[PDB]
Amino acid sequence: GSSGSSGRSPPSNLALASETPDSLQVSWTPPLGRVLHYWLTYAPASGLGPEKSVSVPGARSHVTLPDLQAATKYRVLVSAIYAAGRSEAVSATGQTACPSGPSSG
Numbered sequence: 511g512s513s514g515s516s517g518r519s520p521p522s523n524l525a526l527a528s529e530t531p532d533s534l535q536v537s538w539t540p541p542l543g544r545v546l547h548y549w550l551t552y553a554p555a556s557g558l559g560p561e562k563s564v565s566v567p568g569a570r571s572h573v574t575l576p577d578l579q580a581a582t583k584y585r586v587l588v589s590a591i592y593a594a595g596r597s598e599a600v601s602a603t604g605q606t607a608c609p610s611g612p613s614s615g
Contacts, residue, residue, distance in 0.1 A: 519543060520597035521571070521588045526604020531580035533588070534606055537572035538588060546591045555585040555603045580609045 519541035524615035527535040536550075552575050553561040566573040568591070578584065585605040590597045 516559055516594060517543065518557040518590065518592050518595060520600050521548070521592055522600065523587070524586065524600055524602040526586060527601055528604060531607045531609050532573050533576045534584060534604060535574050535609040536586050536604065540571040543592060546593065549589040549591055549596060551599070552584045553585040553599050555583050578606055580606055582606050
């Protein structure tokens with residue numbers, strides 16, 4: 511494109527893994543540059559409810575989003591924050607896990 515400099519690189523290789531219908535694992539490949547924090551913004555891809563957001567220590571390139579629903583993906587939008595500014599946002603929809611457990615009903 512027109513604008514583009516070698517300094518701020520957004521998180522790529524997004525991988526949404528669902529291990530539980532109450533939480534969804536999500537990771538990515540961190541850049542070489544020093545990143546202050548990772549502004550995560552997950553929400554219902556569908557687009558019916560409000561938008562959420564959870565902070566994460568740049569130190570790690572992954573984070574789990576608890577309090578999630580079942581059989582429902584989530585548009586995870588991550589963004590690398592730098593001293594100068596934050597890079598673009600990368601979206602990624604990942605269907606959650608299905609409900610399964612012992613019940614006497």
